[PDB]
Write an enzyme that holds these catalytic residues in place. Structure first.
Site, PDB file in Angstrom:
ATOM      1  N   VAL A 182       0.822  -1.197   0.000  1.00 61.44           N
ATOM      2  CA  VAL A 182       0.000   0.000   0.000  1.00 61.44           C
ATOM      3  C   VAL A 182       0.870   1.268   0.000  1.00 61.44           C
ATOM      4  CG1 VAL A 182      -2.264  -0.898   0.765  1.00 61.44           C
ATOM      5  CG2 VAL A 182      -0.503  -0.458   2.453  1.00 61.44           C
ATOM      6  N   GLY A 183       1.784   1.385   0.969  1.00 59.96           N
ATOM      7  CA  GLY A 183       2.522   2.640   1.195  1.00 59.96           C
ATOM      8  C   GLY A 183       4.022   2.570   1.462  1.00 59.96           C
ATOM      9  N   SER A 184       4.782   3.359   0.702  1.00 61.49           N
ATOM     10  CA  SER A 184       6.236   3.466   0.896  1.00 61.49           C
ATOM     11  C   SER A 184       6.749   4.889   0.685  1.00 61.49           C
ATOM     12  CB  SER A 184       7.005   2.486  -0.006  1.00 61.49           C
ATOM     13  OG  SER A 184       7.195   1.232   0.634  1.00 61.49           O
TER      14      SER A 184
ATOM     15  N   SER B 203       7.599   0.344   5.297  1.00 61.32           N
ATOM     16  CA  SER B 203       6.727  -0.177   4.228  1.00 61.32           C
ATOM     17  C   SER B 203       5.541  -0.980   4.781  1.00 61.32           C
ATOM     18  CB  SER B 203       7.512  -1.024   3.229  1.00 61.32           C
ATOM     19  OG  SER B 203       8.286  -2.022   3.888  1.00 61.32           O
ATOM     20  N   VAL B 204       4.416  -0.922   4.073  1.00 68.20           N
ATOM     21  CA  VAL B 204       3.168  -1.520   4.543  1.00 68.20           C
ATOM     22  C   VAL B 204       2.512  -2.348   3.449  1.00 68.20           C
ATOM     23  CG1 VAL B 204       0.844  -1.028   5.516  1.00 68.20           C
ATOM     24  CG2 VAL B 204       2.788   0.398   6.151  1.00 68.20           C
TER      25      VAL B 204
ATOM     26  N   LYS C 129       3.081  -3.630   8.767  1.00 65.82           N
ATOM     27  CA  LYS C 129       4.155  -2.657   8.518  1.00 65.82           C
ATOM     28  C   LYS C 129       5.501  -3.274   8.876  1.00 65.82           C
ATOM     29  CE  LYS C 129       5.926   1.912   9.943  1.00 65.82           C
ATOM     30  NZ  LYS C 129       5.321   2.712   8.860  1.00 65.82           N
TER      31      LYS C 129
ATOM     32  N   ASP D 175      -0.031   7.506  13.055  1.00 62.48           N
ATOM     33  CA  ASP D 175       1.090   8.402  12.735  1.00 62.48           C
ATOM     34  C   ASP D 175       1.943   7.604  11.776  1.00 62.48           C
ATOM     35  OD1 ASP D 175       3.488  10.442  14.638  1.00 62.48           O
ATOM     36  OD2 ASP D 175       3.291  10.074  12.518  1.00 62.48           O
TER      37      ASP D 175
HETATM   38  C1  LIG Z   1       8.552   6.574  15.818  1.00 62.64           C
HETATM   39  C2  LIG Z   1       7.028   6.500  15.972  1.00 62.64           C
HETATM   40  C3  LIG Z   1       6.216   6.489  14.829  1.00 62.64           C
HETATM   41  C4  LIG Z   1       4.814   6.423  14.984  1.00 62.64           C
HETATM   42  C5  LIG Z   1       4.248   6.380  16.261  1.00 62.64           C
HETATM   43  N1  LIG Z   1       2.897   6.350  16.428  1.00 62.64           N
HETATM   44  N2  LIG Z   1       2.294   7.086  17.240  1.00 62.64           N
HETATM   45  C6  LIG Z   1       0.981   6.812  17.172  1.00 62.64           C
HETATM   46  C7  LIG Z   1      -0.064   7.544  18.037  1.00 62.64           C
HETATM   47  C8  LIG Z   1      -0.599   6.557  19.104  1.00 62.64           C
HETATM   48  C9  LIG Z   1       0.532   8.745  18.783  1.00 62.64           C
HETATM   49  C10 LIG Z   1      -1.189   8.069  17.164  1.00 62.64           C
HETATM   50  C11 LIG Z   1       0.780   5.849  16.254  1.00 62.64           C
HETATM   51  C12 LIG Z   1       2.027   5.570  15.775  1.00 62.64           C
HETATM   52  N3  LIG Z   1       2.396   4.647  14.863  1.00 62.64           N
HETATM   53  C13 LIG Z   1       1.655   4.261  13.805  1.00 62.64           C
HETATM   54  O1  LIG Z   1       0.523   4.711  13.594  1.00 62.64           O
HETATM   55  N4  LIG Z   1       2.163   3.324  13.025  1.00 62.64           N
HETATM   56  C14 LIG Z   1       1.541   2.870  11.905  1.00 62.64           C
HETATM   57  C15 LIG Z   1       0.990   1.617  11.832  1.00 62.64           C
HETATM   58  C16 LIG Z   1       0.378   1.186  10.658  1.00 62.64           C
HETATM   59  C17 LIG Z   1       0.293   2.007   9.549  1.00 62.64           C
HETATM   60  O2  LIG Z   1      -0.327   1.493   8.451  1.00 62.64           O
HETATM   61  C18 LIG Z   1      -0.477   2.428   7.364  1.00 62.64           C
HETATM   62  C19 LIG Z   1      -1.658   1.881   6.580  1.00 62.64           C
HETATM   63  N5  LIG Z   1      -2.889   2.315   7.231  1.00 62.64           N
HETATM   64  C20 LIG Z   1      -3.884   2.553   6.157  1.00 62.64           C
HETATM   65  C21 LIG Z   1      -5.000   1.496   6.224  1.00 62.64           C
HETATM   66  O3  LIG Z   1      -5.658   1.635   7.509  1.00 62.64           O
HETATM   67  C22 LIG Z   1      -4.789   1.534   8.658  1.00 62.64           C
HETATM   68  C23 LIG Z   1      -3.308   1.342   8.268  1.00 62.64           C
HETATM   69  C24 LIG Z   1       0.843   3.284   9.604  1.00 62.64           C
HETATM   70  C25 LIG Z   1       1.463   3.698  10.784  1.00 62.64           C
HETATM   71  C26 LIG Z   1       5.081   6.413  17.410  1.00 62.64           C
HETATM   72  C27 LIG Z   1       6.479   6.470  17.264  1.00 62.64           C
END
Ligand SMILES: Cc1ccc(-n2nc(C(C)(C)C)cc2NC(=O)Nc2ccc(OCCN3CCOCC3)cc2)cc1
Ligand SMILES: CCCCCCCCO[C@@H]1O[C@H](CO)[C@@H](O)[C@H](O)[C@H]1O
Ligand SMILES: CCCCCCCCO[C@@H]1O[C@H](CO)[C@@H](O)[C@H](O)[C@H]1O
EC number: 2.7.11.24
Length: 331
Positions: free
Chosen positions: A27-29, A30-31, A46, A159
């Site tokens: 989907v995204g760039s 990895s996921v 991811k 995020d």
């Molecule tokens: C270094 C780092 C990076 C990200 C985070 N983080 N922080 C948070 C919150 C709790 C503060 C909102 C959440 C993250 N990490 C995060 O969301 N990781 C993440 C996990 C999966 C991801 O998948 C992207 C694809 N999406 C699109 C499809 O629907 C859901 C998944 C994208 C990002 C914390 C620390």
């Protein structure tokens, strides 16, 4: 027991995952999007990139896993699974995170919305932020692409890690030494406005243009805010500006629900101490059809003390390993 893993290449990248996860598709760039055979759910997997290459990467890896393990709220991304193909610490070099697959992000639907949709999407953002903020976690980068939404309009904050600057609280651009959780309320203000109008509120070309556009709407700081600015240089510059009054928001956001306009005025205040909090905003009249004081939970406390520590790569690596091993999946 350790699941059975299978290997494949996807977009220059090798993927080694439990057979539980089928039909991987980037989907995204990895996921990758995948099918989770154990639950029947479509999931996002991811693969962290170079998670232990440096001390910085290693601590970032640990930071992300620890935070995701903590999040247990309907409007915040959660961790369905975390795995490594490694059988021991010594060969541990890769980390994969599994979360629910959502339909799209908010950037790819406001690419405009009815008022009831705005009410419901902003409500869910605030509900998730009340939760994140009660744990003393600050997002700092809230923007439409960090919001994942289904066709049900169910929303989750994430995020990924459309310019970031456009949604950033002005204090972050003034490199303010400290800043608090209402930086996120500023961002919600920006997002809500854009949903109501279909236009970026503050599309600055850089941080200077950004503040320029911000001050145009909200006005130059008053005496009371200036009292709280420790920077000589900033104070002098701010005071040297041509003074501008706060605009009337009902004329900026012409025809919008008056309750929405009122909420925006309470979010988009230069002085961060005077912005509405997420918990207060949920009780705002704009969300009368969605607000339920007994279903707006807070988070368990979250220990961020590790942020102050300076550890070796192998120490952050071991700590992350422990977190992978101790993971308990949700029911
Ligand atoms: C270094 C780092 C990076 C990200 C985070 N983080 N922080 C948070 C919150 C709790 C503060 C909102 C959440 C993250 N990490 C995060 O969301 N990781 C993440 C996990 C999966 C991801 O998948 C992207 C694809 N999406 C699109 C499809 O629907 C859901 C998944 C994208 C990002 C914390 C620390
Ligand atoms: C423009 C120069 C930025 O000055 C900034 O002002 C803030 C408010 O006093 C401080 O907290 C920041 O650390 C300082 O760099
Ligand atoms: C030209 C634009 C000036 C921007 C001024 C931003 C004011 C932000 O608001 C400030 O946030 C700080 C950080 O949390 C608090 O410590 C201060 O009390 C508060 O006034």
């Amino acid at each position: 027991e350790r699941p059975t893993f299978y290997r494949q290449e996807l977009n220059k990248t090798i993927w080694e995952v439990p057979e539980r996860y089928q039909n991987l598709s980037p989907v995204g760039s990895s996921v990758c999007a995948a099918f989770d055979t154990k639950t029947g759910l479509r999931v996002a997997v991811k693969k962290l990139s170079r998670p232990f290459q440096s001390i910085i990467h290693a601590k970032r890896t640990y930071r992300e896993l620890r935070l995701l393990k903590h999040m247990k709220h309907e409007n915040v991304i959660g961790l369905l699974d975390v795995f490594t193909p490694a059988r021991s610490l010594e060969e541990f070099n890769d980390v994969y995170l599994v979360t629910h697959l959502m339909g799209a992000d908010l950037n790819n639907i406001v690419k405009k919305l009815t008022d009831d949709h705005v009410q419901f999407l902003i409500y869910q953002i605030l509900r998730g932020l009340k939760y994140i903020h009660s744990a003393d976690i600050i997002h700092r980068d809230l923007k439409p692409s960090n919001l994942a939404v289904n066709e049900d309009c169910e929303l989750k904050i994430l995020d990924f890690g459309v310019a970031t600057r456009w949604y950033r609280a002005p204090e972050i651009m003034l490199n303010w030494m400290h800043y608090n959780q209402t930086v996120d309320i500023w961002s919600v203000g920006c997002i809500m406005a854009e949903l109501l109008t279909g236009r970026t509120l503050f599309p600055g070309t850089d941080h200077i243009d950004q503040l320029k556009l911000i001050l145009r709407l909200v006005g130059t700081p008053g005496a009371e805010l200036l009292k709280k600015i420790s920077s000589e240089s900033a104070r002098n510059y701010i005071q040297s500006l041509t003074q501008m009054p706060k605009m009337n928001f009902a004329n900026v956001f012409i025809g919008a629900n008056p309750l929405a306009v009122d909420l925006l005025e309470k979010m988009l205040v230069l002085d961060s101490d005077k912005r509405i909090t997420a918990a207060q905003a949920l009780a705002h009249a704009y969300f009368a059809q969605y607000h339920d004081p007994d279903d707006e939970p807070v988070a368990d406390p979250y220990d961020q003390s590790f942020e102050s520590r300076d550890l070796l790569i192998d120490e952050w690596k071991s700590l992350t390993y422990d977190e992978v091993i101790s993971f308990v999946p949700p029911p």
